[PDB]
Subunit: 347 residues, 4 copies
């Protein structure tokens, strides 16, 4: 039935050797599911984590990963709306307190008692993982789990960021980083949501990917000397919305400056040490809003998966073995990635 030993990728100090090795299988707590993870998307977040790019410390030794699509093989005595066999999703937000003002308003990700997969809780870069039963993602039977894996962070994230840009069907959204993990999903969520899509990315056939997945206007940051100008021109006065999913502080500076007056620039990506600076005068006069968006809630999860089920968004994924995570991380830190890598935990 349930083994005692499994394989994971784990590091013991920040930015230290990523070890592919045999580790213990974790036991569920009363609130938690034990999931046999079949695939895990790899999120740029997981790299920031390994590098120690963020002001919060990770749990060491840490098993990373937070886009885990697997099966429920065990559960706590306190878990309720779950059967053995159900498919489950391990997300960034392993678990919230579900008892504070924030969790009550559906801003579960902002709970100060938040427990995070691939940071403070052993994640989905292993064959077996634990996750809060209340927060976990109900994945419909029959879902190709390799394909859905990225909806679990990149998908819910950009979906919720779009809602928070307060667009309307027919308005322009500019996706900053349109070819990355988060970017190529945002592009589709946004087409599905009725927006006109402009994409800023750059690199080999990054454009091609963008066209193939429904985007309308592409601006290549490798070639366009005046990004702002192009956006302003392409959208006749600026993006009603901007979704910053680059890992560029620069790209973020620009997003403050090509967003439409009365528009909204959303911050999603979180580059090392990054500040968003904008001129006060300019932001006031133009009544521009700059909004931080942090993953999503359960309702965001249910909605975001519904888009995948209907077939309207689909990550451009390559499936490689878990034991190849050091390679994905090298590829990712060079922005070579066209969409998403998901790891098979069998290899």
């Amino acid at each position: 039935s349930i083994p005692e030993t499994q394989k994971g990728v784990i590091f013991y100090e920040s930015h230290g050797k990523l070890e592919y090795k045999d580790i213990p299988v974790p036991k569920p707590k009363a609130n938690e599911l034990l999931i046999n993870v079949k695939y895990s998307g790899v999120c740029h977040t997981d790299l920031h984590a390994w590098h120690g790019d963020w002001p919060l410390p990770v749990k060491l030794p840490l098993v990373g990963g937070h886009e885990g699509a697997g099966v429920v093989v065990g559960m706590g005595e306190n878990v309720k709306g779950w059967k053995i066999g159900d498919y489950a999703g391990i997300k960034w937000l392993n678990g919230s307190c579900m008892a504070c003002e924030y969790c009550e308003l559906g801003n579960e990700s902002n709970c100060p008692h938040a427990d995070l997969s691939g940071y403070t809780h052993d994640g989905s870069f292993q064959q077996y993982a634990t996750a809060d039963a209340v927060q976990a993602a109900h994945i419909p039977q029959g879902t190709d789990l390799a394909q859905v894996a990225p909806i679990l962070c990149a998908g819910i994230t950009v979906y919720k960021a779009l809602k928070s840009a307060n667009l309307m069907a027919g308005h322009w959204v500019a996706i900053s980083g349109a070819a990355g993990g988060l970017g190529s999903l945002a592009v589709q969520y946004a087409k599905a949501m009725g927006y006109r899509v402009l994409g800023i990315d750059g690199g080999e056939g990054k454009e091609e990917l963008f066209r193939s997945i429904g985007g309308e206007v592409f601006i290549d940051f490798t070639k366009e000397k005046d990004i702002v100008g192009a956006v302003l021109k392409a959208t006749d006065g600026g993006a009603h919305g901007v979704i910053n999913v680059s890992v560029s502080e620069a790209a973020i500076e620009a997003s403050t400056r090509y967003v439409r007056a009365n528009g909204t620039t959303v911050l999603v990506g979180m580059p090392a040490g990054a500040k968003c600076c904008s001129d006060v005068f300019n932001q006031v006069v133009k009544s521009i809003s700059i909004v931080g968006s942090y993953v999503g809630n359960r309702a965001d999860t249910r909605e975001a998966l519904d888009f995948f089920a209907r077939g309207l968004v689909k990550s451009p994924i390559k499936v490689v073995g878990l034991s190849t995570l050091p390679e994905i991380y090298e590829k990712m830190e060079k922005g070579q990635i066209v969409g998403r890598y998901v790891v098979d935990t069998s290899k």
Copy 2:
């Protein structure tokens, strides 16, 4: 009955001598009210107009003023909803194209063809002024035009800001510089809107004043030094809303750090150099929004006036002669202005 000559305050160069001289009485176009301004507010926005600072062309020869309280004394053929004897207010936004995206959404401020009182259009620093009938404030019968005049820029601006903060009755709002100028007004609207009010200011008896006008908690920048810590403590986790009257980089920056999760920190004035630098991490992790808020539209205005009608918002004013005006510009170009000054267009 309607004069031909009038007294007013006008210049011929950027930073030219300010001529309290006689000038022609303007004739209203078919779309305008002609207004006999009895009192006008004076703020620093008028200073920057004079100085020729801000980017785009002033209209020389210019009569300044954008806070005009008067009586409709004449009107064009096209005018509707206005009677001779109605009390009218001349705001920053005098008129707009009424035929663009921005205008239609009640964001006329952001019109490409915006006509600006005391800038592109001769303003309230004169006995008789013209104004697009459609934007002009409908001051209610039985409003003291001296006491109401400053409300036409500061009051409405501050009311719009509080809406831009997007709070509900019972949420804490934090107002920087809360006892000086825009602050006092802010505090009073906030209170009248059901918000719990935290004030930050410093100096001779400002705490007393702040209490006397509805302020709940006062944080003293002279005697406290972990502002963030004390705002957090007092509001049990941060301020749902912030209005940033004081515009030091540091005061704004701190807002991003004492603002509650999912809260909104609002940028207000027209400061000609200030930057807002938010840590991307912290802004994303706490789901914070930084909303630039400009001048109110016609609905903002009617609403801001209704609270003042109800006796709920008062400004201490100091009434001196229009003839005295240059003296007051001159005191503003240093900083010898103690308080909120209203000009009497008869003296």
Copy 3:
């Protein structure tokens, strides 16, 4: 160059003979466009005007029409944002006071002094008509004025209704009578807005049509009899939004019962007798809203036109001569109107 005499369609009594006779060309006031209407829509609202049904005074002698597509051929002095040669649209709401609570909130429809095309103001059933410049639609260059004309009442009404339904991309919307008239248009906007579309209609091949225009599920009133049950089943718990084109008491009433919890059921047309009876229990227990939705404001309009610009909303039209008009009123006063009729003001 601009004629003095013109042809138009005018009456002298409530339900009088409809004179296709020559009439003076109206002169625009300083606030108006003079428009050479090339095509006008014809709906039943024009029928009730003629008939003298609705409560308050028609303006005899009257030229009907409220769906006018033309070119700006002249303008008053006050007009802004308009050029000769611009294509313009004459809607139900022609002009308003622009100086009341209602006007300022973009709810001009509800103005006490609302000037209504083909009612209080001679409308689009004529070669040349005048219209308040501020409300007139800005039809984009490169729009076929025949195909666009009906969108000026039905299209916008139907677009506003869907907003009044307050749905998000991926929510089910249920549209009654979905293949006839307002329905087809509704369906197409809904689809273009990201909504999943359920249609209810009945009769000869309406299901086919409905599919051909984006409809997802079709519920056939001929062949099904637990409508509520089938709407519930198909939408897995009810329709987040309902647009009630068909106005039988029963069709509306049912809406309150197939609408999802927290959902919104929208009332649209101008039916001169219909009642909406909701069970208070059921409306309270399912937190249902019943929102009356009227004609779109200037922003509703610019948005509704932009979808049609993009090729996403088409109406089958049938173009017959303005001279032919009374025949069509006459067919409307019974119900011999097969489809959506547009008048050519040259023939």
Copy 4:
């Protein structure tokens, strides 16, 4: 410690004899708290329940009551954020599934698996009761429990109904039934929320109560022949909001007809067999919304109690013995009640 026997009021068939007798103390389930209830507000809902006024059946034999303010003396092994001694509130919504689309959106009351205090779950008309630990109301230590008891249904209910009327500080709200249990709280919530308050009730010193608790304009339905007229007059065109907490189908008819254009009428009260009927034309033309509101959620609970803690709302209560519930019910069915009766479970 915890007795095995206690006293309750219980009936065995609908509208049957209300028995004051010795009953078993209930055992908590894993999810639940066992509360020693000290006081229970009595809600008109509890009467509708005993009479069988509503289309859903009660649990028989039923212990009524759903505004229970007491102490936590025991709890399930699965309960988490609770200590023995905490004060707890039993509300209408004993418990939701907390796992469906609705519960996720914070519309917990609309869960189809909803378990209801004083209908499907033994309520607070007894010394000891069970209640879901996740839904239960955290009452701050030191709260006078007799006074807070009504916040638990009447308070959260009207608070949430006001939010759902979408008013702004300065708009008029008309409370229909301003002197009843729900009414006198709505009046205060609304003053606290910055609205102008108009009240419709009637009966001995019902006005007096209204004045004493902060209401501005009272219209007595015992004396005013034209209620609509008076409201229209009193608020200069109608209530931006209406909160129907009468138990009159009539009063509800009127509320559809004195609500401001663009305003919102909220249905809260649920008289036997009641329909809300409104003219379609009138509701469309005026873009009026009619919205059902069903108690509140946890966040509504936390907010609503915060208003009581700050001292801004206070039920006008008489405290009598539980054993006197047949008398309260007789008084209530004659609309003699000026505010609220709370039952002491010691007598």
